[PDB]
């Protein structure tokens, strides 16, 4: 509903240092970054440290692994990736829940950091990512996949040091998140491929939680111990991303249970900010954006609690399954990580033609349609446990 614009770019467009930038990466080179939406940075370059070896055995956590060096190495492929990503963001922007997620992701702002001297500093790694012309205002970064082409996860620079819910992404301090997403590679769940718009919405909800400092800690996950021993792990149940998912998966600390802390997180950050005015204003605006059209007050405890309740009610209906329910057309998997179910990575031959702005996969999401490469070029078959004795 809210009028925002995302601008389509081309990798052939030149760097004007205004909307198209160069991002300094871990390798020390520079990747042509694009601002598809205000404070939303998108780079068609893959994540750092691409594996030199293809095939073999997947890691003990994930089930489906695909690797490809040649993926996203030519400017034509980077252009294709950029157009696919712009199309996905525009499609998600068309719907009301996607529009609410994009309003916050863009209008959000991490609160300023306190130096050793005690005064607040504006230019911080929490809000800026170094480029060749100095730093720049970023809220979320979208990249290509890592070594694992299938991977789709949201990572940041702020995490709980003592494996406890007090990380930079959980204590109300903002942080910017980097997302490694690939439109061209999809995991199929029970003979149907996931719609990439839903997975991108999942990752952006995680990014928004990280941005406002209200995220469920990612230091919480339940490992699965095959035959119940520590050394043998067949997979892990990351509560952090399940909760973001809708569906029917069973989790103890729900998202509605989450944000009870917000009352106390808001009190803590208000105490931490009280010294400065500008820092206070950002936090108050941040809070106004979290609780839709409020013009909040946080002077007393009762107003704080009312505001926290307003926020919970506002951003409780931003989930994968809720987005699907808004779409109606797209079919979503029931649970999230069925430990025992088989998954078939499918690649998309022609994303530009086979996927549209209005309704992608015009032949549906069945593995046997939209010429979906049942299994993609490379694989890494799962670890094979052998049982032997008399």
């Amino acid at each position: 509903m809210i009028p925002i614009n995302i601008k389509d770019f081309n990798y052939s467009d030149p760097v004007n240092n205004q909307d198209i930038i160069l991002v300094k990466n871990e390798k020390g080179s520079f990747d042509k970054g694009f601002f598809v939406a205000d404070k939303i940075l998108l780079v068609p370059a893959r994540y750092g440290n691409i594996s030199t070896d293809e095939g073999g055995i997947t890691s003990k956590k994930e089930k489906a692994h695909v690797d490809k060096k040649i993926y996203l190495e030519t400017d034509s492929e980077k252009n294709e990736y950029l157009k696919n990503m712009t199309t996905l963001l525009k499609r998600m922007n068309s719907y009301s829940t996607g529009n609410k997620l994009l309003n916050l992701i863009i209008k959000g702002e991490p609160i300023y950091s306190k130096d050793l001297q005690g005064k607040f500093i504006e230019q911080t790694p929490s809000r800026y990512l170094d480029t060749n012309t100095g730093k720049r205002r970023v809220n979320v970064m979208i990249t290509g996949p890592g070594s694992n082409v299938l991977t789709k996860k949201c990572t940041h620079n702020g995490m709980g040091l003592e494996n406890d819910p007090n990380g930079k992404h959980s204590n109300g301090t903002g942080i910017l998140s980097t997302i490694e997403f690939s439109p061209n590679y999809l995991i199929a769940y029970n003979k149907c491929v996931a719609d990439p718009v839903l997975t991108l919405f999942h990752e952006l909800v995680h990014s928004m939680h990280n941005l406002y400092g209200i995220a469920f800690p990612d230091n919480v996950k339940v490992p699965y111990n095959a035959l119940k021993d520590k050394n043998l792990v067949s997979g892990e149940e990351a509560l952090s991303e399940i909760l973001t998912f809708g569906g029917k998966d069973l989790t103890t600390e729900h998202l509605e249970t989450l944000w009870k802390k917000l009352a106390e997180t808001v009190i803590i950050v208000k105490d931490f900010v009280k010294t400065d005015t500008q820092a206070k204003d950002v936090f108050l605006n941040n809070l106004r954006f979290l609780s839709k059209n409020e013009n909040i007050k946080i002077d007393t405890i009762e107003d704080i609690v009312n505001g926290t309740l307003k926020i919970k009610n506002n951003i409780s209906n931003l989930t994968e399954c809720e987005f699907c329910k808004e779409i109606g057309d797209v079919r979503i998997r029931t649970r999230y990580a069925v430990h025992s179910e088989d998954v078939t990575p499918v690649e998309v031959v022609d994303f530009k033609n086979n996927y549209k702005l209005n309704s992608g996969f015009l032949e549906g999401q069945d593995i046997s349609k939209k010429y979906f490469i049942t299994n993609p070029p490379k694989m890494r078959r799962r670890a094979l446990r052998n049982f032997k004795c008399t």
Binding site: T58, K60, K63, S96, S113, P125, S126, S147, C154, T155, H156, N157, G158, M159, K168, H169, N171, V220, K221, V222, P223, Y224, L227, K228, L232, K248, L250, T251, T252, H254, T257, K260, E264, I267, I268, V269, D271, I301, E302, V305, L309, K310, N313, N317, E322, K325, E326, T334, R335, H339, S340, D342, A383, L384, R385, N386, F387, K388, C389, T390
Partner: protein
């Protein structure tokens, strides 16, 4: 030395218990706003960086040594290593145990183990001869026939005091589930050993609720304590759900993952047998492609296709049996070995909360009481609010492929498909329980309170207690088409306050128009509710919430159903009340979101409640609404005066049907009815009977009643005990003909022989409890026949008499009762 190479996924997985052990449920001190937050002890903010990225852990194929043969060897022995005619199947028999047959199948490339001893004879023992096309079809049809019969078996299994579960006999000899020397050794292994056999790894779970609740002592106002103690009710209500999801999650991690592994092995093991048999048929077809007299490769070749089709059909149904056996058995493990553990702890916690609240009441009585009645007003909200919450088994079921009987709720396909929006409470949160989507904006002030089955939304009078439903693409049909609204609304009785603070002000309940804009409106006028339509001309239809069309605080299923532009019929119950013609109007087109708010009410003490606010695409027929209304009620539930189900340790006094307004009093030595006291509801020359009369009495599950359910049932006979003291409604040990109620209050000294066990139950299901007592061997040697409780009048004084009654053909009318529990919509005063 047998080998068994299995996928990393397909090994049995059990969640680590470290996360769940560290999870704790702490004691809380609820305040006006909620839990007390003290910034003094709140942690200081740290702002150090740490990258979220965890490097993937390198993995490789590993070897595991197991002393005894495991299920994996039973699965490795059935995959066909050879794909030729030389392949033979091995089945267990008297010659060698199935644990011995598996090792002969692993070490050999040409043998497949198979628990089915029958289809082995047609495959291994019997081999076809490529001579004539007649004999092969007899062979080809037979191997499909016996396989279908062998894999399609579904034997009922029964246990003492537990739900009977249907099981598959051959799973024991298919996945090494247990000591399976005989095919039938699986059944007796399921009995006398439990459903632990289905799980490879014995699960370990947790006992929460190490803490209780309380109310803060820093209240300064009459309204502060009322708002504070209301928060304690909600906080306890939510914790009754959080523990349920915490325990349900623990069950999924520790039990249902193993079951999905066991069920997934059934997908594989049967597919191995289906593969080899289907492979044999293909080579059988090719093996008979020589010596053709023609028409034998067109006719009796489709039979080969028929054999192929029959094998897959049997396996598809056999998998359905596996889902109905194993996957149902997972819930039966939960209902027996997990749910009793958590229910005991929660009740123990809830008792501790009651002590704290009552202690807080005594302090509130000392300082700043209003002296309303015995210096305690909110005790009505406490017993009413502290109702046990049944486990919503829709949590487990949604995870499960089989259409389990645990659903046990059937709705009309036409009616269910016509549903568009269904507001309601699900696991203690407002949800849109429809399959469609609607933009619902839950207000801050809205609180969930106990209702008919699940909690009910309380539209309080406060400004921020509104629900907003946007008119999206799905809800655009309310413009020029038929639509039906259904909802359970409990409007509190027309009070003196309601009729004094306003006289003729008609304030909205559900608003969908603005001034000079079209829309539909639900409003209350001078204590009567009515449906409003704005079109070409505004049309207002009254709705009777009771006799004389005045609010009675009774749970009612108002259903403004018909908007077919021919008629507007309304069903306050299963029966139509009022109708109108809509020829005048043509459309209701508005962009204004559907609002549930009380706007314009002068009284600020009015609670309007809603439970299932539904919208339907069709103008439901008179037949449908009867089915819709009757769907809510079950033939097994018992409800109090207002339609809420009975609850143990809820204080409610009972009055008769014929003798309205007369409570229970103790005469010389019996139970009698006090003289009727009739009061003025509104204060204008009209008098109606009082409700809160007689003994304040509760009811508790009897010692002899095994059923471990939390709420009473049309069964589960329950002793009736006075709240005031250890007093039990019962009979004397020595009764001949004067079957009056001793109301002894004695079960201690020489009076243990008191028949205080009653069976409350409601035939017509209209909040009318009919207390049935079964025939018992009365002391002194007399046999007293079964019958309900009625009234018998001696002199000027009535009496509670046990009149004879056998079954429904007798006249149970005028022998019923209504249980009335306080509530803040019905005040019994001047």
């Amino acid at each position: 030395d047998i080998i068994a190479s299995v996928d990393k996924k397909d090994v049995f997985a059990v969640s680590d218990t470290s996360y769940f052990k560290n999870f704790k449920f702490p004691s809380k001190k609820i305040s006006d706003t909620g839990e007390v937050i003290d910034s003094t002890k709140l942690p200081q903010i740290k702002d150090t960086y740490k990258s979220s990225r965890e490097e993937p852990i390198p993995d490789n194929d590993s070897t595991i040594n197991v002393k005894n043969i495991t299920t994996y060897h039973y699965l490795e022995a059935q995959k066909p290593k050879n794909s030729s005619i030389e392949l033979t199947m091995v089945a267990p028999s008297k010659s060698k145990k199935p644990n011995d047959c598996v090792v002969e199948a692993i070490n050999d490339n040409n043998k497949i183990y198979t628990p089915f001893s029958g289809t082995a004879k047609q495959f291994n023992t019997v081999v076809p001869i490529a001579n004539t096309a007649a004999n092969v079809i007899t062979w080809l049809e037979a191997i499909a026939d016996i396989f279908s019969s062998e894999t399609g078996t579904f034997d009922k299994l029964e246990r003492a005091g537990k739900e009977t579960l249907y099981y598959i006999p051959y799973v024991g000899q298919l996945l090494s589930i247990g000591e399976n020397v005989l095919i039938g050794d699986f059944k007796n292994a399921l009995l006398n050993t439990g459903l632990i056999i289905l799980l490879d790894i014995a699960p370990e779970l947790n006992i929460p609720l190490l803490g209780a609740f309380e109310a803060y002592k820093e209240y300064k106002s009459l309204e502060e304590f009322r708002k504070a103690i209301d928060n304690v009710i909600d906080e306890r209500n939510k914790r009754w759900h959080s523990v349920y999801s915490f325990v349900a999650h623990q069950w999924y991690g520790q039990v249902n993952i193993q079951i999905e592994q066991r069920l997934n092995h059934f997908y594989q093991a049967l597919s191995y047998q289906a593969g080899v048999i289907k492979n044999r048929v293909d080579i059988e077809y090719a093996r008979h492609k020589e010596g053709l007299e023609e028409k034998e490769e067109r006719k009796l070749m489709w039979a080969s296709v028929d054999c192929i089709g029959s094998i897959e059909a049997s396996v598809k149904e056999a998998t359905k049996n596996a889902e109905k056996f194993l996957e149902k058995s997972s819930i039966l493990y939960f209902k027996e070995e997990i749910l009793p553990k958590v229910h005991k702890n929660l009740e123990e916690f809830d008792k501790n909360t009651l002590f704290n609240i009552y202690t807080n009441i005594d302090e509130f009585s000392n300082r700043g009481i209003a002296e309303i009645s015995e210096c305690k007003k909110v005790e009505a909200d406490v017993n009413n609010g502290f109702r046990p919450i049944k486990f919503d088994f829709s949590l487990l079921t949604n995870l499960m492929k089989s259409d389990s009987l645990t659903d046990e709720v059937i709705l009309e396909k036409a009616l269910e498909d016509a549903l568009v929006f269904s507001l309601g409470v699900r696991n203690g949160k407002i949800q849109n329980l429809s399959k469609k989507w609607a933009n619902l904006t839950i207000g801050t002030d809205i609180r969930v309170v106990h209702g008919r089955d699940n909690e009910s939304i309380r539209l309080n009078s406060t400004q921020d207690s509104s629900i907003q439903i946007e008119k999206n693409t799905n809800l655009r049909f309310l413009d020029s088409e038929n639509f039906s609204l259904s909802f359970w609304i409990r409007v509190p009785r027309y009070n003196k306050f309601d009729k004094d603070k306003d006289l003729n002000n008609e304030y909205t309940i559900v608003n969908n128009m603005d001034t000079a804009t079209k829309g539909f409106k639900i409003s209350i006028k001078n204590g009567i509710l009515l449906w409003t339509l704005k079109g070409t001309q505004q049309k207002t239809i009254e709705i009777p919430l009771s006799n004389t069309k005045v609010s009675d605080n009774i749970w009612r299923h108002v259903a403004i159903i018909n908007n077919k532009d021919g008629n507007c019929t309304i069903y306050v119950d299963g029966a139509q009340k009022n109708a109108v013609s809509l020829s005048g109007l043509d459309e209701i087109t508005n962009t204004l979101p559907i609002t549930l708010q009380l706007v314009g009410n002068k009284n600020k003490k009015q609670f309007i409640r809603l439970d299932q606010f539904n919208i339907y695409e069709k103008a439901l027929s008179q037949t449908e609404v009867g089915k819709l209304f009757s769907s809510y009620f079950k033939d097994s539930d018992i409800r109090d005066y207002w339609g809420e189900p009975l609850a143990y340790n809820k204080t409610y006094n009972m009055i008769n049907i014929a003798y309205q307004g007369r409570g229970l009093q103790s005469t010389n030595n019996k139970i009698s009815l006090q003289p009727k006291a009739v009061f003025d509801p509104t204060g204008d020359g009209s008098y109606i009977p009082r409700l809160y009369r007689g003994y304040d009495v509760l009811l508790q599950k009897d010692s002899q009643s095994k059923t471990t359910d939390i709420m009473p049932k049309k069964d589960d006979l329950i002793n009736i005990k006075l709240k005031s003291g250890h007093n039990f409604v019962g009979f004397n040990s020595t009764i001949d003909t004067s079957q009056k109620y001793l109301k002894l209050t004695t079960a201690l000294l020489s009076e243990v022989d008191d028949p205080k066990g009653f069976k409350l139950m409601s035939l017509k299901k209209d909040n009318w409890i009919q207390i049935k007592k079964e025939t018992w061997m009365s002391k002194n040697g007399n046999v007293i026949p079964q019958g309900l409780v009625g009234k018998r009048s001696v002199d000027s004084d009535v009496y509670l008499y046990l009149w004879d009654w056998e079954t429904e053909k007798d006249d149970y009318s005028e022998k019923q009762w209504s249980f009335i529990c306080q509530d803040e919509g019905w005040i019994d005063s001047d």
